[PDB]
Design an enzyme around this catalytic site. Structure first.
Site, PDB file in Angstrom:
ATOM      1  N   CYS B 108      -6.918   0.975   1.721  1.00 16.65           N
ATOM      2  CA  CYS B 108      -6.311   2.098   2.440  1.00 16.65           C
ATOM      3  C   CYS B 108      -7.000   3.433   2.251  1.00 16.65           C
ATOM      4  O   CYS B 108      -7.021   4.048   1.138  1.00 16.65           O
ATOM      5  CB  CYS B 108      -4.807   2.217   2.157  1.00 16.65           C
ATOM      6  SG  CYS B 108      -3.996   3.576   3.059  1.00 16.65           S
ATOM      7  N   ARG B 111      -4.892   7.174   1.464  1.00 17.99           N
ATOM      8  CA  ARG B 111      -4.105   7.349   0.212  1.00 17.99           C
ATOM      9  C   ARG B 111      -3.929   8.760  -0.356  1.00 17.99           C
ATOM     10  O   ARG B 111      -3.156   8.942  -1.278  1.00 17.99           O
ATOM     11  CB  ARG B 111      -4.586   6.400  -0.885  1.00 17.99           C
ATOM     12  CG  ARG B 111      -4.258   4.935  -0.580  1.00 17.99           C
ATOM     13  CD  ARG B 111      -4.863   4.027  -1.642  1.00 17.99           C
ATOM     14  NE  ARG B 111      -6.283   3.760  -1.435  1.00 17.99           N
ATOM     15  CZ  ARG B 111      -7.105   3.288  -2.367  1.00 17.99           C
ATOM     16  NH1 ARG B 111      -6.682   3.055  -3.603  1.00 17.99           N
ATOM     17  NH2 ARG B 111      -8.367   3.047  -2.060  1.00 17.99           N
ATOM     18  N   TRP B 280       0.585   6.976  10.004  1.00  9.46           N
ATOM     19  CA  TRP B 280       0.088   7.333  11.332  1.00  9.46           C
ATOM     20  C   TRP B 280      -1.320   6.794  11.473  1.00  9.46           C
ATOM     21  O   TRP B 280      -1.987   6.454  10.489  1.00  9.46           O
ATOM     22  CB  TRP B 280       0.122   8.841  11.582  1.00  9.46           C
ATOM     23  CG  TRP B 280      -0.540   9.653  10.501  1.00  9.46           C
ATOM     24  CD1 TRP B 280      -1.905   9.924  10.342  1.00  9.46           C
ATOM     25  CD2 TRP B 280       0.114  10.329   9.371  1.00  9.46           C
ATOM     26  NE1 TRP B 280      -2.126  10.699   9.221  1.00  9.46           N
ATOM     27  CE2 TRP B 280      -0.955  10.976   8.599  1.00  9.46           C
ATOM     28  CE3 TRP B 280       1.445  10.470   8.940  1.00  9.46           C
ATOM     29  CZ2 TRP B 280      -0.685  11.728   7.459  1.00  9.46           C
ATOM     30  CZ3 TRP B 280       1.698  11.218   7.790  1.00  9.46           C
ATOM     31  CH2 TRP B 280       0.652  11.848   7.078  1.00  9.46           C
ATOM     32  N   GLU B 285      -8.605   2.759  14.732  1.00  7.70           N
ATOM     33  CA  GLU B 285      -7.773   1.555  14.752  1.00  7.70           C
ATOM     34  C   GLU B 285      -7.433   1.165  16.195  1.00  7.70           C
ATOM     35  O   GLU B 285      -7.514  -0.021  16.564  1.00  7.70           O
ATOM     36  CB  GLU B 285      -6.529   1.736  13.893  1.00  7.70           C
ATOM     37  CG  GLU B 285      -6.865   2.171  12.457  1.00  7.70           C
ATOM     38  CD  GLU B 285      -5.598   2.302  11.619  1.00  7.70           C
ATOM     39  OE1 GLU B 285      -5.089   1.230  11.211  1.00  7.70           O
ATOM     40  OE2 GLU B 285      -5.122   3.444  11.375  1.00  7.70           O
TER      41      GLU B 285
HETATM   42  C1  HEM Z   1      -0.346   8.018   6.315  1.00 10.59           C
HETATM   43  C2  HEM Z   1      -1.094   7.533   7.294  1.00 10.59           C
HETATM   44  C3  HEM Z   1      -2.050   6.413   7.023  1.00 10.59           C
HETATM   45  C4  HEM Z   1      -3.394   6.221   7.538  1.00 10.59           C
HETATM   46  C5  HEM Z   1      -4.258   7.025   8.466  1.00 10.59           C
HETATM   47  C6  HEM Z   1      -3.727   4.954   6.870  1.00 10.59           C
HETATM   48  C7  HEM Z   1      -4.982   4.348   7.156  1.00 10.59           C
HETATM   49  C8  HEM Z   1      -5.242   2.935   6.977  1.00 10.59           C
HETATM   50  C9  HEM Z   1      -6.403   2.251   7.599  1.00 10.59           C
HETATM   51  C10 HEM Z   1      -7.459   2.789   8.539  1.00 10.59           C
HETATM   52  C11 HEM Z   1      -6.340   0.882   7.073  1.00 10.59           C
HETATM   53  C12 HEM Z   1      -7.281  -0.240   7.375  1.00 10.59           C
HETATM   54  C13 HEM Z   1      -6.751  -0.792   8.689  1.00 10.59           C
HETATM   55  C14 HEM Z   1      -7.947  -1.175   9.501  1.00 10.59           C
HETATM   56  O1  HEM Z   1      -8.603  -0.256  10.084  1.00 10.59           O
HETATM   57  O2  HEM Z   1      -8.206  -2.403   9.512  1.00 10.59           O
HETATM   58  C15 HEM Z   1      -5.171   0.829   6.181  1.00 10.59           C
HETATM   59  C16 HEM Z   1      -4.838  -0.394   5.466  1.00 10.59           C
HETATM   60  C17 HEM Z   1      -3.725  -0.476   4.539  1.00 10.59           C
HETATM   61  N1  HEM Z   1      -2.916   0.582   4.304  1.00 10.59           N
HETATM   62 FE1  HEM Z   1      -2.987   2.620   4.909  1.00 10.59          FE
HETATM   63  N2  HEM Z   1      -2.810   4.349   6.091  1.00 10.59           N
HETATM   64  C18 HEM Z   1      -1.812   5.244   6.143  1.00 10.59           C
HETATM   65  C19 HEM Z   1      -0.527   5.060   5.461  1.00 10.59           C
HETATM   66  C20 HEM Z   1      -0.186   3.918   4.625  1.00 10.59           C
HETATM   67  C21 HEM Z   1       1.162   3.735   4.031  1.00 10.59           C
HETATM   68  C22 HEM Z   1       2.368   4.656   4.145  1.00 10.59           C
HETATM   69  C23 HEM Z   1       1.018   2.455   3.293  1.00 10.59           C
HETATM   70  C24 HEM Z   1       2.065   1.795   2.442  1.00 10.59           C
HETATM   71  C25 HEM Z   1       2.958   2.525   1.767  1.00 10.59           C
HETATM   72  C26 HEM Z   1      -0.363   1.961   3.523  1.00 10.59           C
HETATM   73  C27 HEM Z   1      -0.947   0.760   2.912  1.00 10.59           C
HETATM   74  C28 HEM Z   1      -2.062   0.028   3.419  1.00 10.59           C
HETATM   75  C29 HEM Z   1      -2.210  -1.394   3.061  1.00 10.59           C
HETATM   76  C30 HEM Z   1      -1.378  -2.250   2.104  1.00 10.59           C
HETATM   77  C31 HEM Z   1      -3.421  -1.753   3.818  1.00 10.59           C
HETATM   78  C32 HEM Z   1      -4.146  -3.087   3.894  1.00 10.59           C
HETATM   79  C33 HEM Z   1      -3.573  -3.943   5.025  1.00 10.59           C
HETATM   80  C34 HEM Z   1      -4.223  -5.297   4.862  1.00 10.59           C
HETATM   81  O3  HEM Z   1      -4.677  -5.628   3.726  1.00 10.59           O
HETATM   82  O4  HEM Z   1      -4.271  -6.039   5.871  1.00 10.59           O
HETATM   83  N3  HEM Z   1      -1.064   2.787   4.469  1.00 10.59           N
HETATM   84  N4  HEM Z   1      -4.401   2.057   6.170  1.00 10.59           N
HETATM   85  C1  12S Z   2       0.751   1.914   7.253  1.00 18.89           C
HETATM   86  C2  12S Z   2      -0.543   1.795   7.999  1.00 18.89           C
HETATM   87  C3  12S Z   2      -1.028   2.922   8.641  1.00 18.89           C
HETATM   88  C4  12S Z   2      -2.227   2.826   9.338  1.00 18.89           C
HETATM   89  N1  12S Z   2      -2.732   3.909   9.962  1.00 18.89           N
HETATM   90  N2  12S Z   2      -2.869   1.639   9.418  1.00 18.89           N
HETATM   91  C5  12S Z   2      -2.439   0.502   8.771  1.00 18.89           C
HETATM   92  C6  12S Z   2      -3.272  -0.788   8.835  1.00 18.89           C
HETATM   93  C7  12S Z   2      -2.742  -1.879   9.760  1.00 18.89           C
HETATM   94  C8  12S Z   2      -3.600  -3.129   9.981  1.00 18.89           C
HETATM   95  C9  12S Z   2      -3.090  -4.000  10.946  1.00 18.89           C
HETATM   96  C10 12S Z   2      -3.764  -5.175  11.274  1.00 18.89           C
HETATM   97  C11 12S Z   2      -3.211  -6.097  12.323  1.00 18.89           C
HETATM   98  C12 12S Z   2      -4.246  -6.108  13.462  1.00 18.89           C
HETATM   99  C13 12S Z   2      -4.569  -4.718  14.027  1.00 18.89           C
HETATM  100  N3  12S Z   2      -3.880  -4.430  15.277  1.00 18.89           N
HETATM  101  C14 12S Z   2      -4.971  -5.501  10.656  1.00 18.89           C
HETATM  102  C15 12S Z   2      -5.512  -4.653   9.697  1.00 18.89           C
HETATM  103  C16 12S Z   2      -6.831  -5.094   9.094  1.00 18.89           C
HETATM  104  C17 12S Z   2      -7.967  -5.128  10.139  1.00 18.89           C
HETATM  105  C18 12S Z   2      -9.356  -5.569   9.648  1.00 18.89           C
HETATM  106  C19 12S Z   2      -9.766  -6.863   9.932  1.00 18.89           C
HETATM  107  C20 12S Z   2     -11.026  -7.306   9.511  1.00 18.89           C
HETATM  108  C21 12S Z   2     -11.434  -8.720   9.845  1.00 18.89           C
HETATM  109  C22 12S Z   2     -11.897  -6.455   8.814  1.00 18.89           C
HETATM  110  C23 12S Z   2     -11.466  -5.155   8.539  1.00 18.89           C
HETATM  111  N4  12S Z   2     -12.305  -4.311   7.853  1.00 18.89           N
HETATM  112  N5  12S Z   2     -10.224  -4.739   8.969  1.00 18.89           N
HETATM  113  C24 12S Z   2      -4.828  -3.461   9.350  1.00 18.89           C
HETATM  114  C25 12S Z   2      -1.248   0.574   8.046  1.00 18.89           C
HETATM  115 CL    CL Z   3      -3.085  -1.529  15.080  1.00 18.02          CL
END
Ligand code: HEM
Ligand code: 12S
Ligand code: CL
Ligand code: HEM
Ligand code: 12S
Ligand code: CL
Ligand code: CL
Ligand code: CL
Ligand code: ZN
Ligand code: ZN
Ligand code: ZN
Lengths: 407, 411
Positions: B108, B111, B280, B285
């Site tokens: 994340c 954070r 948010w 994304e």
């Molecule tokens: C406040 C606004 C937030 C932004 C901009 C943010 C941003 C992100 C982004 C860009 C990712 C990677 C998703 C992707 O691009 O694949 C992510 C993953 C994650 N975020 Fe944050 N986040 C935010 C808030 C939070 C909150 C409130 C939580 C939990 C309390 C959280 C917990 C995580 C977790 C557990 C993952 C990993 C999901 C996975 O392993 O599939 N995020 N977040």
């Molecule tokens: C609380 C929160 C806020 C936020 N802005 N973004 C998130 C992450 C959500 C998210 C959701 C999905 C479901 C599919 C997306 N529509 C998947 C992921 C992980 C995506 C990903 C996949 C792979 C294969 C590599 C990589 N670096 N990242 C992350 C959580």
């Molecule tokens: Cl999404």
């Protein structure tokens, strides 16, 4: 122990058995992943020799044959007697190709078997090294139609007689710190440039000054040489739409040639083993031009395209970045100097990796390096899970020699 | 032991000690790195240590380590485990726990915000209908009319693993996907399977490109049940481009609230299997992943057609060109409608400052480079050149298998 990798775009699952033959260590532990860290005796030698020869004789399908046993005996005898041993030409060609085949950070590996290997094991002086390098450069450049090559100088002996090329690439631009406080040229090469001036180089003090080679033969003090200017193919950078782009005065060289790594084959260490292929466009347009610690031109290009640079969310950096990269590729293509774009290069690697899984049972790959430094998720490697591990023969990093060298 | 990380752009070197508190496992061995692999019933016996270590962390953080209150809480939790096999967290411990799972989430980038998390305690919830109501309140609070606020809703913890609370949706808000007889997909291909289940459970699908899915909610290990989020509670943004007037005519929109609903929150050994959380969006994304993945809405071609890019060869970088404009469009749309969104330049800069601050104050900041670095323009963001160390701290968010593979149907 029987690992699976998933592609998240296509759902294809591949199985890796090759990692079982993994030898060197990764840096990682069960508690801590080091995946994003850039750098994480006669007794010892015979095992290393045996392991390599076993893989050599199995590759030519004569594992367990008399010729296999006889060579093993002969190498064993030679190590006992001389505490080293000499590779046969065939063994050398095989090992160098496999060092590339094994290079987990290299996207270009589909090409691995077409490497041209120049045996420079008969070289004895820095002057011989220079002649060998010029011929490598000219052979590989080939008037713009680049061809992969490596030149292999003599192996390490007692560690006091190392051959080394002090330059990190055969071709690179100088860096000078200014009275001003800014850097003229390539900031990556400032220390090395100082060593060259220290050793006598007459620096032109321009922006794109091709550095002299600094060559170390037989553990002797390094000597300076200028590559013939007519052998260093360069490309002026223009954009197919933006007239003004050429007025940035940008150019780059055609030949990427890594000269500071160590090649280990069957326990033997080739500390001078420069190798070259051809550029993937992002290497110049993204890294060399846009890294803040390199030529750092994002701001100037953006200014000239007249984008709203007030706020990051206009993506003005991203816009200028695509345009610089378009210009790089266009300029190389117009001059017919081999270049590959990141889409094509990563597509090729995915085909390679599939072949390697099918025919070899694996393909060690380092995701951090394989995914291009722009537009990652729109290339097919982004979604491809990869396993990173170390096979031998291998290219390894080694300390800069000016930290090691008793003068 | 000290571990140093380097930044290759600035040459700043930081020292990690925090890794010494690492518990769980990475997937990696000394022979194999699994850094790019996506996916890496408790007895009394295992539980008390996990409880003890959590409560020690909690009491340290409040400067009360070794206090009478600390010792009494340990003894209290101890008896409760031996007598009932589990234990209940104080409200303050739950809050602290939930903030830490986020603080510890190494994938994340967001954070910097970890200490501003609204925790809703829903441990008194007993039915699917109760869950629905809690989730609607979460959505409305978190949306706050476009001015998004982070929040998590925590339903009752696992007991014997036969009474789990689960939100079957992977996000609270997501669009249906429908596979057609001709092989094409309508809507979001990521959600085809879940859409089939919803339909099988009785949902009347509109079958458009952007249908908000129903919630499918399981309370106390019972069969799950369908609920429609009130439409007026689902904030959406239609996608237009600041310069290209044809962009709106693509028909694109997205929802404003990213809300992950399929993860497991572990605190002090206890397992919270339904714990939806939301923040948010970072623009990438939506613009890179949701729109431009080939296995998603896959709009790159159609956008490039409209810009009339040279599509005859990848080396025109037409894909890279369409990608930037799409992402410019997403950010512009959200900003124009006053819905919170962050660009990847801003978000990564914030993360690097967060990370350095964490090293100074905490001795570390576990981070997963593969995930932290954005899916476009990687190297001109300040995270690309940052070495990171990835390790697992508790409290944590964990993956769990999809409930339709494991659920024992009551009928
Ligand atoms: C406040 C606004 C937030 C932004 C901009 C943010 C941003 C992100 C982004 C860009 C990712 C990677 C998703 C992707 O691009 O694949 C992510 C993953 C994650 N975020 Fe944050 N986040 C935010 C808030 C939070 C909150 C409130 C939580 C939990 C309390 C959280 C917990 C995580 C977790 C557990 C993952 C990993 C999901 C996975 O392993 O599939 N995020 N977040
Ligand atoms: C609380 C929160 C806020 C936020 N802005 N973004 C998130 C992450 C959500 C998210 C959701 C999905 C479901 C599919 C997306 N529509 C998947 C992921 C992980 C995506 C990903 C996949 C792979 C294969 C590599 C990589 N670096 N990242 C992350 C959580
Ligand atoms: Cl999404
Ligand atoms: C055919 C042309 C080639 C292309 C397009 C190619 C592509 C690349 C790219 C893109 C990188 C990473 C640089 C970056 O991060 O941007 C790389 C690294 C590497 N390549 Fe290849 N390559 C080619 C030829 C070769 C050859 C001929 C060898 C050896 C014989 C080789 C061995 C390596 C090694 C060892 C690394 C990593 C260097 C390090 O760890 O610092 N490459 N190559
Ligand atoms: C034989 C060959 C062919 C080719 N096309 N490209 C190469 C590139 C080798 C190389 C050389 C350098 C020298 C220093 C900077 N120009 C650097 C790199 C990549 C450096 C790097 C750093 C970081 C921090 C991350 C990352 N993914 N890659 C790679 C070699
Ligand atoms: Cl380079
Ligand atoms: Cl770099
Ligand atoms: Cl993804
Ligand atoms: Zn860089
Ligand atoms: Zn690892
Ligand atoms: Zn994706």
């Amino acid at each position: 122990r029987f690992l699976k990798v998933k592609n998240w775009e296509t759902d294809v699952v591949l199985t890796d058995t090759l990692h079982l033959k993994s030898t060197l260590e990764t840096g990682c532990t069960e508690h801590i992943c080091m995946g994003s860290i850039m750098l994480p005796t006669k007794d010892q030698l015979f095992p290393l020799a045996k392991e390599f020869l076993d893989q050599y004789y199995s590759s030519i399908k004569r594992f367990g044959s008399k010729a296999h046993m006889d060579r093993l005996e002969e190498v064993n005898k030679e190590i006992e007697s001389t505490s080293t041993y000499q590779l046969k030409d065939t063994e050398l060609i095989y090992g160098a190709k496999h060092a590339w085949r094994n290079a987990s950070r290299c996207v270009g590996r589909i090409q691995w078997s077409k490497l041209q290997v120049f045996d420079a094991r008969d070289c004895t002086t820095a002057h011989g090294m220079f002649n060998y390098i010029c011929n490598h450069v000219k052979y590989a450049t080939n008037k713009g139609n680049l061809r992969s090559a490596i030149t292999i100088f003599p192996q390490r002996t007692d560690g006091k007689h190392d051959f080394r090329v002090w330059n990190s690439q055969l071709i690179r631009y100088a860096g000078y710190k200014q009275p001003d406080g800014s850097t003229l040229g390539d900031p990556a090469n400032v220390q090395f440039t100082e060593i060259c001036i220290q050793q006598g180089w007459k620096a032109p003090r321009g922006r794109f000054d091709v550095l002299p080679l600094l060559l170390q033969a037989n553990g002797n003090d390094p000597e300076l040489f200028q590559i013939p200017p007519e052998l260093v193919l360069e490309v002026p950078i223009r954009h197919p739409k933006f007239d003004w782009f050429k007025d940035l005065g940008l150019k780059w060289y055609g030949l990427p040639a890594v000269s500071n790594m160590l090649l280990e084959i069957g326990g033997l260490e080739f500390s001078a083993c420069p190798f070259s292929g051809w550029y993937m466009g992002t290497e110049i347009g993204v890294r060399d031009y846009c890294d803040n610690s390199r030529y750092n031109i994002l701001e100037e290009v953006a200014k000239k395209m007249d984008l709203d640079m007030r706020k990051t969310s206009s993506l003005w950096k991203d816009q200028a970045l695509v345009e610089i990269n378009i210009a790089v590729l266009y300029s190389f293509q117009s001059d017919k100097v081999t270049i590959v774009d990141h889409h094509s290069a990563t597509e090729s690697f995915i085909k390679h990796m599939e072949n390697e899984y099918r025919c070899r049972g694996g393909c060690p790959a380092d995701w951090v390096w394989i995914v291009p430094p722009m537009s990652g998720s729109i290339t097919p490697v982004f979604h491809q899970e990869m396993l990173n591990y170390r096979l031998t023969p291998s290219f390894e990093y080694q300390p800069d020699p000016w930290n090691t060298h008793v003068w």
